[PDB]
Design a protein around this ligand. Structure first.
Ligand SMILES: [Zn+2]
Ligand SMILES: [Zn+2]
Lengths: 61, 54, 110, 35, 76, 82, 227, 91, 392, 97, 55, 40
RNA sequence: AAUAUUUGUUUAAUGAAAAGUAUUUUAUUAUUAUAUUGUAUAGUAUUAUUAUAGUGUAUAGUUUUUUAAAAAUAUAAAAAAUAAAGUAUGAAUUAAUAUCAAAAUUUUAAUAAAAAUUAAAAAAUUA
RNA sequence: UAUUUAAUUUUUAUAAUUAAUAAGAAAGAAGAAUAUAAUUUA
């Protein structure tokens, strides 16, 4: 019985840690879609002090 | 360097005070009842003890 | 940064409250007497290897502090600033000379 | 030795003389004679 | 004795405050930068008691400011 | 839209009391020896203060014998031959 | 090693000061968490030889984020304990610092020292914060109330708004302290500290919670007052 | 480091710094072949991230595994079909 | 082996096989048992070794035994409490008798003489004070007994208070009785507000500003007439101006200005109130506001020498973020010397206040910074709070 | 050329003209990054101005140079500009034959 | 230590410049023009004014 | 809130909040004296 | 002895019957069982280097280790890593001594810090 | 730890009339620390 208890206990914690993880990644990708959304109106390139022509060059990227 | 500190000798040598025989202070029946601290010149207003609960 | 100095601070402050409670004047107070004499003591085990031990003694002292009023006193000025403070403040827009404003003495006609 | 002449240094004033310029100068005099 | 308190030493020469005169502080400031903060023109190594200006100190290649009498609140 | 361990259990059919007991030490749920800190142990009432029971100040870390019986110790009627 | 992140810690002038740690590994780990934390909230109060080191590193992160490059990003991402902070860096700092090249962080030596040990405390901020998007009108003179609450705002500046994706993260991380198992963690921590004993740590019967619902409903109240 | 999904065994690779050390053995990531968040394991070690001064950058040498994986992909055989498009040093 | 006494407090080195002893952690020494074991005594409940038997008898006799009083007795006690009217008569009388015989200071030449202490005065004044409901500075009183003029005023105003209370009743006690179950300030109350104003006025000469400002509060507590109200409000403005309370100065300052319609033409009060309201604006650094105010004062009061002085001063003196940053006056230096943050203590790196208990700065509820316990809190087995890889 | 303080002296032009033939293959169309004191940041800001070429940098009006070095912020720009101004013509001459 | 030291031995240390320096010495200070607190020049307040203009 | 107030104080002719309220309550009290002298 | 020591900025000690001490205020079935009885931290004088062992199992990161130069010691590659002004805590060996005993020469019953002669040793701190 | 040597007592404008084989306002980082005595900086 304590064998089966020991395994049953380690199984479902593995289960809910995955629930944690999936929901986490979900929320973080939501976050990133929010950031991607907000960076557009503000006009944030997040490619630095340079204008678009700089990575257009593609020598520097 | 500006201050002046010279070491006190009472810290080097501190013999305990003479104990009483049969709890008799030899001069009780001679001297006055004035608190010794007073005549010594020892006095205070607040005595703040840090061994108190407060 | 010394511990003693902090202890003496607590003492100073309390005796200052007391000396103002007695009717004296804060600004003309000065330390008349500061001394310290040995107080009670506690003890502690220090266990040393191979079945040895010694007694660590935790010491404690009594402190005696007397504040006295001294009318003749004149205090050195601490309101002087380093040149740096002066012109940094100038560049900030602050006045380097603090504002005095004349205040009419309190009087009762009613 | 704690004396003044020995302790004080001229580092702060080096911009008054153009070390780089003179090094290149004697490199010119290095190739001119062919070393 | 009169109380042992030192008078103001802030404006005398100090060897550890003298180090900061020519030191570069651009990172210690944000809005308020001044040309050289610790350096007082004409006065020796920052200290106001030690003023040299409009005496004859011969300094061919460096600038020197003229003399205006200092106020009482800048010394002590 | 968070994790919320209770509604995480309700989805997995795990009996929410149990799921929580997965994530705190075995000491605080099931009858098993383990480190206890003397400040948890609780204190009788002083003149200034009230009494302090470790029941009140640590509801969650108190042992649950429902789980203890259903998990660790054996049933008698499972073994009976009579 | 002239590259503007990877650091050399000596006492010679070519190198930035080596603050006391266990092993150059441990040192690097410390540096990383100071940088992480300073990017998260703009100021870092820091003791010892760490402070100049922290300033220089900060300047290096801003320099990287200015470079605005994929290799730059990925190099910063190697270095930080927080991935999201890389994003906050490359989003924010380029607008912020576009007009200045040099010395982006301001170190300030504090007149108070740790009582723990004589070591001196420094206050390290990023410089001009009025161009900062999410740090705009903040006032660090004193701390906030409960440390999971959004920091103070200058009176004239009350009604400012911040990037949605940052306050999302912040509220997420905040919401685990309104839970009960945190309160249990709090009491039990008191107990633990007392056992190791650190003086002036109240008995866990006296420890009443950091967060209640009343304090909360007024906190949210003034939080939307600031919005 | 080399990482392969548990279920579909899809392979990919990236550097792991001193900060990500707890994630070296198991990663969670989005798998392109089976589309969802999955679990990746560490088969083989490749290279460092940082380096010490006056020392070569490329000698915590990647294993024979990772190099075999970079021969199989990105080799003469692997590149030969794609070159009719690009010959990657070219645009 | 065994280089010191066999007592288990003794100085030098011992051995366990020779001089065996059990393990005592902190055991009170040969004299005094001191601060440390006592700390244990007041928190843990006994000395930390657990050997010592807790003996609380003497403090039990001092606290619980003393307050024991049986219901039948304490039910009847409040029937025998002293009569307040008689109390005021007595306290006033002997307070006065004690002040009249306080010697006049001998004025020396070349050095200031120490004013003879008030030891004996503190006893009557303490009872007089709490009979009345107002607290008085000892300092201000001493300063009052220095100046001949002030000692005169104080003396006779006291005398009148005495007389009006003996022939009549105590008006604040009347107005207290009619309150829980509207008229102009009575004669005795006038006497009172006058003597309190005098003692506060002396309290300024000595340079305790906080105390003068505190005393005039209780002073206005007694004035129900408009003019006394104006004057006293103004005085509180000037006392809180020196004490560097600008909010209180800018409050009490404008009350005196509000009261101008119902106050007689013979009052300097409202003008003063204006002055204070203005100055309190000026020390908080807004000079437009200041000039506006003084402009209104010279609008209403035409020529006024005080408002003239402030007109000329503001005229002579001629950023929102930097306002009231400056320390301009000395009393906040004095208050800055206490209640300040020092190197090594009383800063945020030493002990911190939380809900009236002391914490180490390690665990500080307002700060999550480096070394704080809250950095190590973990995720508490629920959800992932942050995207941080390594720490948290 | 590189570490020169302030003005660019003629003895210093000489250094440049000398090191012109130290490198055998160069066309007036050569990419910017071969220049003295041309950094990554300096190059980038030049590129978004559509300038890839030593000729193009020797074509600058010098009030482009300053606001390139002040409002924009490439330091030591005047050094690369001056270096170009120097070198451009001998490149054309070695270009013809 | 081969021998017990007498009171003079103990006092000899306090003649030293080291001992004086460490223990008995007075600090120079002035009043912060912002804080009205006592202050040593070169150390500052965590405050928005003290950090900008450091006085 | 900065420009909010910069709008507020310039609607009031360069007054502040306290000067506005002070003026107001002053008027209400002078009109209380008016009610007084009209009633008495 | 203003000495040594201590110094709490980041955890896979998962598990734990054999410990024979530690006010659980009511720790607690909902049982399927019947009565009765009993569940959390003290081995080695310590909250020690850190226990012994029988269970059973593998992604709960299961969350107390000061510091702003250099010799020499210890590890590892004379380089590298660590440790020494420091705030606070505070032992142990030792102790016939005068504010100390430095240099040389001879003698004296055996080193002679004993004599006698000539002489020229400042204080503090560190190695 | 006593003696004994070696070093130090934290810029001394400067050193040698002889012995033996040398000392001006003061302590944080000596660096505002990534070798510029500010690389332009809000
Ligand atoms: Zn897959
Ligand atoms: Zn300040």
């Amino acid at each position: 019985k304590r064998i089966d208890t020991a395994k049953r206990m380690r199984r479902d914690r593995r289960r809910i840690e995955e629930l944690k993880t999936l929901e986490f990644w979900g929320w973080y990708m939501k976050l990133q879609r929010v950031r991607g959304r907000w960076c557009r109106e503000q006009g944030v390139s997040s490619r630095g002090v340079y204008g678009p022509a700089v990575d257009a060059a593609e020598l520097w990227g | 360097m500006y201050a002046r500190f010279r070491t006190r000798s009472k810290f080097y040598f501190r013999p305990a005070r003479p104990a009483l025989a049969y709890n008799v202070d030899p001069n009780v029946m001679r001297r006055p009842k004035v608190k010794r601290g007073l005549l010594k010149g020892t006095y205070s207003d607040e005595t703040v003890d840090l061994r108190d609960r407060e | 940064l010394r511990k003693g100095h902090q202890i003496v601070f607590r003492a100073l402050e309390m005796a200052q409250q007391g000396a103002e409670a007695k009717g004296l004047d804060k600004e003309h107070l000065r330390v008349a007497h500061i001394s310290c004499y040995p107080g009670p003591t506690d003890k502690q085990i220090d266990i040393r290897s191979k079945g040895y031990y010694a007694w660590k003694t935790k010491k404690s002292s009594h402190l005696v502090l007397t504040l006295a009023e001294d009318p003749e006193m004149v205090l050195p000025d601490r309101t002087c600033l380093p040149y740096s403070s002066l012109m940094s403040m100038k560049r900030a827009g602050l006045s380097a000379q603090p504002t005095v404003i004349d205040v009419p003495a309190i009087t009762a006609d009613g | 030795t704690n004396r003044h002449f020995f302790v004080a240094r001229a580092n702060a004033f080096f911009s008054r003389l153009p070390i780089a310029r003179v090094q290149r100068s004697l490199a010119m005099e290095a190739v001119r004679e062919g070393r | 004795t009169p109380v042992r308190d030192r008078k103001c030493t802030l404006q005398y020469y100090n060897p550890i405050r003298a180090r900061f005169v020519y030191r570069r502080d651009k990172p210690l400031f944000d809005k308020y930068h001044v040309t050289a903060r610790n350096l007082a023109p004409g006065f020796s190594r920052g200290a106001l008691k030690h003023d040299w200006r409009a005496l004859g100190v011969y300094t061919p290649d460096h600038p020197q400011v003229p003399y205006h009498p200092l106020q009482t609140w800048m010394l002590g | 839209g968070r994790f919320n361990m209770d509604e995480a259990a309700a989805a997995l059919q795990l009996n929410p009391a149990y799921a929580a007991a997965l994530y705190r030490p075995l000491n605080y749920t099931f009858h098993i020896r383990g480190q206890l800190y003397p400040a948890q142990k609780g204190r009788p009432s002083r003149p200034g203060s009230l009494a302090a029971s470790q029941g009140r100040m640590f509801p969650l870390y108190q042992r649950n014998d429902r789980l203890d019986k259903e998990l660790f110790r054996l049933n008698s009627r499972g073994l009976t031959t009579e | 090693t002239t590259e503007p992140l990877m650091a050399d810690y000596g006492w010679t002038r070519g190198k930035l000061p080596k603050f006391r740690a266990r092993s150059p590994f441990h040192r690097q780990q410390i540096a990383r968490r100071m940088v992480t934390e300073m990017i998260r909230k703009d100021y870092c109060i820091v003791g010892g030889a760490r402070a100049p080191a922290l300033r220089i590193l900060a300047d290096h992160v801003v320099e990287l984020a200015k470079a605005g490059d994929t290799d730059s990003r990925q190099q910063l991402a190697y270095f930080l304990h927080d991935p999201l902070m890389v994003d906050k860096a490359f989003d924010e700092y380029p607008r912020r610092f576009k007009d200045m090249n040099a010395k982006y962080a301001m170190m300030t030596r504090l007149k108070s020292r740790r009582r723990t040990d004589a070591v001196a405390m420094y206050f390290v901020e990023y410089k001009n914060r009025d161009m900062s998007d999410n740090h705009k009108g903040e006032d660090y003179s004193a701390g906030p109330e409960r440390f999971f609450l959004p920091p103070r705002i200058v009176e004239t500046e009350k009604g400012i708004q911040r990037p949605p994706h940052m306050q999302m993260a912040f509220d997420r991380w905040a919401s685990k302290f309104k839970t009960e198992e945190f309160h249990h963690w709090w009491r039990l921590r008191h107990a633990k500290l007392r056992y190791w004993g650190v003086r002036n740590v109240p008995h866990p019967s006296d420890v009443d919670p950091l967060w209640t619902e009343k304090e909360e409903e007024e906190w949210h109240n003034e939080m939307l007052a600031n919005t | 480091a080399l990482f392969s999904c548990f279920r579909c065994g899809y392979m990919y690779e990236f550097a792991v710094s001193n900060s990500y050390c707890r994630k070296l053995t198991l990663r969670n990531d989005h798998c392109p072949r089976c589309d969802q968040l999955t679990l990746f394991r560490f088969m083989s070690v490749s290279g460092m991230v940082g380096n010490m001064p006056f020392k070569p950058i490329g000698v915590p040498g990647p294993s024979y595994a990772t190099l075999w994986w970079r021969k199989t992909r990105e080799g003469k055989e692997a590149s030969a079909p794609l070159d009719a498009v690009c010959k990657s040093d070219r645009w | 082996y065994q280089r010191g006494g066999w007592s288990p407090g003794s100085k030098h080195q011992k051995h366990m096989t020779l001089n065996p002893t059990l393990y005592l952690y902190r055991f009170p020494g040969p004299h005094g048992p001191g601060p440390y074991t006592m700390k244990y005594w007041w928190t843990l409940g006994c000395f930390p070794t657990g050997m010592e038997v807790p003996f609380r008898l003497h403090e039990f006799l001092s606290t619980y035994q003393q307050e024991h009083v049986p219901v039948e007795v304490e039910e009847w006690l409040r029937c025998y409490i002293k009569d307040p009217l008689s109390e005021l008569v007595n306290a006033s009388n002997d307070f006065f008798k004690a002040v009249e015989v306080y010697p006049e200071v001998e004025s020396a030449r070349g050095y200031k003489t120490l004013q003879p202490s008030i030891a004996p005065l503190l006893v009557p004044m303490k009872k007089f004070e709490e009979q009345l409901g107002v607290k008085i500075s000892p300092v201000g009183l001493r300063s009052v007994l220095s100046n001949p003029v002030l000692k005169d005023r104080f003396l006779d105003d006291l005398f009148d208070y005495k007389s009006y209370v003996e022939k009549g009743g105590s008006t604040p006690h009347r107005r207290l009785a009619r309150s829980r179950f509207a008229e102009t300030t009575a004669d005795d109350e006038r006497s009172l507000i006058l003597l309190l104003t005098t003692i506060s006025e002396g309290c300024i000469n000595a340079g305790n500003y906080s105390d003068a400002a505190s005393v005039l509060a209780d002073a206005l507590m007694f004035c129900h007439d408009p003019d006394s109200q104006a004057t006293t409000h103004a005085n509180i403005s000037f006392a809180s101006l020196l004490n560097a309370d600008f909010k209180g100065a800018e409050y009490n300052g404008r009350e005196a200005a509000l009261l101008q319609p119902q106050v007689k033409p013979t009052s300097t009060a409202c003008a003063r109130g204006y002055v204070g309201w203005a100055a309190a604006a000026a020390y908080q650094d807004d000079f437009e506001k200041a000039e506006a105010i003084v402009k209104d004062g010279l609008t209403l009061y035409v020529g006024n020498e005080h408002l003239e002085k402030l007109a000329n001063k503001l005229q002579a003196l001629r950023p929102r973020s930097l306002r009231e940053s400056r320390s301009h006056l000395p009393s906040q230096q004095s208050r800055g010397l206490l209640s300040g943050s020092g190197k090594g203590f009383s800063n945020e790196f030493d002990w911190v206040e939380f809900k009236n208990k002391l914490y180490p700065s390690k665990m500080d509820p307002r700060n999550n910074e480096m070394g704080s316990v809250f950095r190590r809190v973990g995720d508490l087995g629920s959800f992932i709070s942050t995207s941080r890889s390594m720490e948290r | 050329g590189i570490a020169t303080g302030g003005r660019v002296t003629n003895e210093d032009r000489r250094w440049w003209l000398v090191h012109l033939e130290c490198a055998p293959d160069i066309t007036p169309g050569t990419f910017i990054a071969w220049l003295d004191c041309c950094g990554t940041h300096t190059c980038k800001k030049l590129i978004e101005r559509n300038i890839w070429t030593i000729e193009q940098v020797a074509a600058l009006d010098s009030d482009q140079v300053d606001e390139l070095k002040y409002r924009e912020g490439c330091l030591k720009m005047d050094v690369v500009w001056e270096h170009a101004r120097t070198i451009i013509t001998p490149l054309r001459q070695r270009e013809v034959t | 230590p081969k021998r017990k030291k007498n009171p003079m031995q103990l006092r000899r240390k306090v003649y030293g410049l080291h001992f004086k320096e460490k223990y008995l010495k007075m600090e120079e200070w002035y009043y912060c023009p912002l804080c009205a607190e006592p202050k040593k020049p070169g150390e500052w307040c965590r405050r928005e004014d003290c950090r900008q203009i450091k006085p | 809130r900065g420009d909010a107030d910069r709008n507020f104080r310039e609607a009031f002719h360069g007054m502040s909040l306290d000067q506005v309220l002070f003026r107001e309550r002053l008027r209400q009290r002078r009109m209380q004296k008016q009610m007084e002298e009209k009633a008495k």
